[PDB]
Amino acid sequence: GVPTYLLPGSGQFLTTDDHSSAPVLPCFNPTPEMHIPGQVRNMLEVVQVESMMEINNTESAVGMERLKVDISALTDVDQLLFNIPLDIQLDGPLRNTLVGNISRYYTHWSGSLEMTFMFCGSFMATGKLILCYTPPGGSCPTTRETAMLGTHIVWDFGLQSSITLIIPWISGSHYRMFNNDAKSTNANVGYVTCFMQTNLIVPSESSDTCSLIGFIAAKDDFSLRLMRDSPDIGQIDHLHGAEAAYQ
Amino acid sequence: GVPTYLLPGSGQFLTTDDHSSAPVLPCFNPTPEMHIPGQVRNMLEVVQVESMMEINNTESAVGMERLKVDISALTDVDQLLFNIPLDIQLDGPLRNTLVGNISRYYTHWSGSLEMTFMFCGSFMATGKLILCYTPPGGSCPTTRETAMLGTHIVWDFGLQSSITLIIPWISGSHYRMFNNDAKSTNANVGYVTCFMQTNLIVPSESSDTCSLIGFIAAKDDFSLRLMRDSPDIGQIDHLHGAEAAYQ
Amino acid sequence: LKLGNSAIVTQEAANYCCAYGEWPNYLPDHEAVAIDKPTQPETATDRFYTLRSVKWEATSTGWWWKLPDALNNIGMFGQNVQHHYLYRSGFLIHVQCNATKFHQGALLVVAIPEHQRGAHNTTTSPGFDDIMKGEAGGTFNHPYVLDDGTSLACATIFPHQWINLRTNNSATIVLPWMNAAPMDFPLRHNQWTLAIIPVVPLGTRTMSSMVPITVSIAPMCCEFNGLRHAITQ
Amino acid sequence: AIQTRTVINQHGVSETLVENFLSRAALVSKRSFEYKDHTSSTAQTDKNFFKWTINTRSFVQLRRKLELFTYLRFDAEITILTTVAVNGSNNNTYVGLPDLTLQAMFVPTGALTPEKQDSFHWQSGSNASVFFKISDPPARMTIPFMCINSAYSVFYDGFAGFEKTGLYGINPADTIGNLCVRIVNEHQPVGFTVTVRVYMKPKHIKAWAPRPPRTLPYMSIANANYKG
Amino acid sequence: AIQTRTVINQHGVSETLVENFLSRAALVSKRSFEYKDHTSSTAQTDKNFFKWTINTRSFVQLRRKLELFTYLRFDAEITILTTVAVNGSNNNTYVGLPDLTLQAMFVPTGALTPEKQDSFHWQSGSNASVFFKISDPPARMTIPFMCINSAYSVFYDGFAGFEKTGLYGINPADTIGNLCVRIVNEHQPVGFTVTVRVYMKPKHIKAWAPRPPRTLPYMSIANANYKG
């Protein structure tokens, strides 16, 4: 017999182990694995594709029209139109997105996001619109004048329908540095703002309240680490379908 | 000593394991294995050979004459003579067959069956007889006219004594999709029917009530998976020979 | 354009969506292990079945047609759906709208694998009537939640195009088979769910003047099981 | 409301794989069944044995994890952690906890699910069982991929059949098994309230057609109804 | 009466092998023998030890499985799962379950089967025994092929001899052994009702001359009589 000793930790059940156990019900060939399309091998290609944000930060606009923002002829010049923060696990536009929801399963979500806006107006709905992105170190812009000083682009959607923004190295995490307090410390690591460079003008027969949506995706340098339980849905513990599989 | 830890599941008895244990009563050479004929290495060559079915679906005909069907001069033209379903684990002709009984030991029994009929009449007992097989997607035929539309063969047994049918890809299983209900869900995956193309005619000295039997076998593509206890015989628990080996 | 069927749809430049990057295809080596006699590569079934044009208003929320729920009970696809137990088909989703250049709106054309859509504030499962809708299809009572408890803000990870009416009025999603099964029964199951969901309401200076969303579906590489089988030999 | 930020180097891609992302042994079902000596058959089919159809939708967090993807193929490593507890009191020093064994039998589709702790289905033999004890390490059975199609339809846009009502999302396939756990020992004079906490670790995970996650709270296991 | 169908790929032939088909450890014999301290010898030759002649015909499902074939050669892996149970009551906290050992001794043909728990046949030495405990894993003895012909005649068209009556189907050969299980410990002041559930897994299985299965219910172990 091989002389073995039980190590400290033998016989315990770790929930995060790769130990292959005894295959119960053996010599059973399963259904043979066929090439189902859309194969997911990683969470990165999940978040690398575009996904809309809750751009309307007004709490009166909930449900459908919170994925879109209204630009009218009375929305004037030099006005903050959306104030999207580039932070994942707090309330805002980056809540029910792909990247935000997948990175809510993880603590650390350092990387780069690829956030894309398309204007949803008429074909000749022309208007110059300045998008200002601000770094984590800095104050949020309130006017077009302080939007021009920061790193910004001027997107005239008269001829270009979708604008494509590349964001350098957003890095946020979950912090529990306090001793057993469970404070759930958050982070502010960026803002993407919108301002009106000129009045949005439309033909008289077309709608003046022209709308705008936007997406967000991720690049290859975006990555996640140290998976956790996502607190989007809690345990309800009284589901109607429950205690029926238990029967 | 080799440092070992007890895995979760060590010391348990799985009934479906291939672990070779300690050979009790050793250095004992058995009776040396000689070539006994008819060696069975697989359940496929069991079911690949022909076996009769309970073709008479009438419950009045039980025992002997349920393996055969009577064709007389008064059985007329365009009449349904047998209505064999191609389903294994429900009551019918496919109950006490080889393939049905072996595949009652298994849940999934996808494959092809090779079901063979021979006419058991006189030598000059001539009669055109149409056999219609229907796919799982479709209704059971009731007349010769709807038997001709489906995939069918016309077997005149005046000169040919045994007819041989090949059935493409019957696939049935056992389903317990309901949560702990034990409904024992079944499947309907085919029918083989019989109709009279013309009146069966016989000489006056021979018997008019000419009989017909049939067999069923399986091909090489027939296969079984996920073995279970066969419910053909239940536990009686009061057998007379029992408690005598226990003495 | 799109002349490979018995019915064509004339439109602008294609700009197709290779749905998950892959084209429709028939059974490869999976044919031998699946249900036998699948041979019929039904080409009259590939007719471009244009559903009736659902009516885009500003007050509208969305529409959906499950892909075996649509195209059944009509045409060659419907007749072979009743006569055939199981099938495999990719779908060429083609979504058009005769919207003017002056019209305002975005439209999430999204095709959903297994849209097991839930009911609203009832714990019971949706049934035959509110799932198997048919040619006209159902409407999203809550398009933001996609009637499934999910989020429309992440509906774009599915195979999707975008009718931004200022740049395109045409969608083309070339769906593959999309099932765990190699071939599956069209009566009891839907592999896909086309969803015409306006994330922007239709905009005009009037009371959202009329555009129709005409939806045209061709089952690409549609393959049923064969009723006509030589049962002899 | 302290706002702090840290720089993360984070040069890894393998932690976001689907295999690592779903291959965590999470609590998928747990109840305490009352094994204490039943002279009278009361609250039958749930009293003296633990029955649970093997589904990932029973617990909400792990449920929302696996309905991130439409189609999934995995060999569910089932780890069954049973902790007994004596109901009532006998003495003050030590009540005496026996090393009683349990038959954590796996009942697949097409197989007879037991309805009592002494039914004939426990001794079937065809449906595989493990016999493990409290003093033993918890039973680690890695059940294989039990589905007649090639992936688990965690959404099934359709019904189990063309008739009846309530089968939406109920695949005739998947139906991974009926995890039936009893106590093999005949009823002790003292009783135990044994809670079977079974953990599922999906293994050899392949995901297909990735989806938006669930955002409003769930209302039922069998469906995907929502509180909008 | 729901009627559903599924498409099964099912590209396997090895699951229908005879070795896999009969190599499942099924319950072949089980009774509870009353080991509790016998000051008076009552109900002798069955009270204080478990005797069972090793035959596959004792349980019906496994019996119908092995009389699918006429001739069988297998080394019967015998797994003996004994669960004791204290009859009566002593206290309310813990009755105290000792780690008592058992001699699961295998008595072949031509060997003396014991008639009591303290007979001299238990200490024979020639007939091999395993000594295992309740706290130990169950005793896995793989007994070899014990037959003076080359296969087990699960039907024997004939008698054990040309004279006497009742030997039809009783092979002078086969007679695989007398599985005799006792408790090695001398009688405790408290009693245990130990049930010996022994499981046979046939190993290295070769089958010959395959047969129709049994269709009406059995009526006796020794014969194949039928209720027609």
Kindly state the DSSP code that residue A80 receives in the 8-state scheme: E
- Look at residues C185, C31, C76 and name the one whose alpha carbon lies nearest to residue B189: C185
Which of A7, A15, A18 would you mutate first to test chain B, the one with the most B CBs within 10 A? Answer: A7
Both tokens assigned to A72: 């009218």
Q: How far apart are CA D198 and CA D78, in angstroms?
A: 7
Q: How far apart are CA D213 and CA E104, in angstroms?
A: 57
* Chain B (131-190) residues lying within 8 Å, Cβ to Cβ, of chain E: 136, 171-173, 175, 177, 183, 185-189
Query: Which amino acid, B110?
Result: S
- In the block, tokens 């649509």 appear at C70
CB contact under 8 A, D112 and B9: no
Q: How far apart are CA A55 and CA A83, in angstroms?
A: 8
Q: How far apart are CA C3 and CA B99, in angstroms?
A: 50
Rg of the Cα atoms in chain B: 24
CB contact under 8 A, A27 and E10: no
Kindly state the DSSP code that residue B100 receives in the 8-state scheme: H
Subunits with 3+ C-beta pairs closer than 8 A to E: A, B, C, D
Angle CA D199–D205–D207, to nearest 5: 120
CA of B71: how far to CAs of B78, B125, B196, B204, E54, in Å?
13, 11, 9, 15, 51
Both tokens assigned to E198: 């022994």
Rg of the Cα atoms in chain E: 20
Both tokens assigned to D70: 């439409």
Mark out the alpha helices in C11-54 (DSSP H runs): none
Q: Are strands E49-53 and E139-142 parallel, antiparallel or unpaired?
A: unpaired
- Contacts of A238 by beta carbon, 8 Å cutoff, 6+ apart: none
Subunits with 3+ C-beta pairs closer than 8 A to D: A, B, C, E
Q: Are A110 and A136 in contact (CB under 8 A)?
A: no
HEC per residue, chain D: CCECCCCCCCCCCHHHEHHHHHCCCEEEEEEEEECCCCCCCCCCCCCCEEEEECCCCCCHHHHHHHCCEEEEEEEEEEEEEEECCCCCCCCCCCCCCCCCEEEEEEECCCCCCCCCCCCCCCCCCCCCEEEEECCCCCEEEECCCCCCCCCEECCCCECCCCCCCCCCCCCCCCCCCEEEEEECCCCCCCCCEEEEEEEEEEEEEEEEEECCCCCCCECCCCCCCECC
Q: How far apart are CA A138 and CA D218, in angstroms?
A: 40
- Look at residues E108, E104, E106, E114 and name the one whose alpha carbon lies nearest to residue E173: E108
Q: Which residues of chain A lie closer than 8 angstroms to E14, CB-CB?
A: 27, 29
- In the block, tokens 């083309």 appear at C172
Both tokens assigned to E86: 């204290």
- Look at residues C12, C201, C197, C14 and name the one whose alpha carbon lies nearest to residue C111: C197
CA of A99: how far to CAs of A109, A112, C67, in Å?
9, 11, 29
Q: Are E97 and E106 in contact (CB under 8 A)?
A: no
Q: How many CB pairs under 8 A join A and B?
A: 55
Q: Are D32 and D182 in contact (CB under 8 A)?
A: no
Residues in chain A: 247
Q: How far apart are CA B61 and CA E105, in angstroms?
A: 53
CA of E146: how far to CAs of B18, B24, B39, E170, E202, in Å?
21, 12, 20, 15, 12
CB contact under 8 A, D64 and A230: yes
β partners of residue A69: A212
Both tokens assigned to D13: 């891609």
Q: Which residues of chain C lie closer than 8 angstroms to A241, CB-CB?
A: 123
Q: How far is C-alpha D203 from the chain's CA centre?
A: 15
- Look at residues A172, A105, A179 and name the one whose alpha carbon lies nearest to residue D6: A172
Nearest chain E Cα to A27, which residue? E15
Q: How far apart are CA C68 and CA C82, in angstroms?
A: 11
CB contact under 8 A, C182 and E11: no
Technique employed here was: cryo-EM
- Contacts of A84 by beta carbon, 8 Å cutoff, 6+ apart: A53, A55, A57, A92, A93, A94, A191, A192, A193, A194
Give all strands (DSSP E) within chain C, no chain letters: 17-18, 49-56, 63-66, 87-97, 106-111, 160-164, 170-175, 193-197, 211-224
* Chain B (1-30) residues lying within 8 Å, Cβ to Cβ, of chain E: 11-13, 15-26, 28, 30
User: What is the number of alpha carbons within 13 Å of residue B238 lying toward its C-beta?
Assistant: 0
> At A100, phi and psi to the nearest 5?
-65, -40
CA of B96: how far to CAs of B54, B102, D110, E214, E218, in Å?
7, 10, 19, 9, 16
Q: Are C176 and C24 in contact (CB under 8 A)?
A: yes
Q: How far apart are CA B8 and CA B1, in angstroms?
A: 21
- Look at residues B64, B93, B44 and name the one whose alpha carbon lies nearest to residue B216: B93
Q: How far apart are CA D220 and CA C186, in angstroms?
A: 26
Q: Are B40 and A48 in contact (CB under 8 A)?
A: no
CB contact under 8 A, E150 and B42: no
CB contact under 8 A, D167 and C122: no
Q: How far apart are CA E228 and CA C223, in angstroms?
A: 50
Nearest chain C Cα to A241, which residue? C123
Would you call A45 helix, strand, or coil by DSSP?
helix
CB contact under 8 A, C205 and A125: no
CA of A151: how far to CAs of A115, A132, A134, A226, D118, in Å?
15, 6, 7, 32, 74
Both tokens assigned to B76: 């007329």
> At E111, phi and psi to the nearest 5?
-120, 155
DSSP B28-45: ---S-----SSEE-BSHH
Nearest by CB: E62 against D89, D125, D172:
D125
Helix (H) or strand (E) run with residue A205 in it = none
Rg of the Cα atoms in chain A: 24
Q: How far apart are CA E100 and CA E85, in angstroms?
A: 12
Both tokens assigned to A22: 């005894």
- Look at residues B13, D184, B228, B241 and name the one whose alpha carbon lies nearest to residue E77: B13
Q: How many CB pairs under 8 A join B and D?
A: 102
How many angstroms away from the CA of C202 is the closest CA of chain E? 44
Subunits with 3+ C-beta pairs closer than 8 A to A: B, C, D, E
Q: Is B182 on the interface with A (CB under 8 A)?
A: no
Angle CA D204–D210–D213, to nearest 5: 110
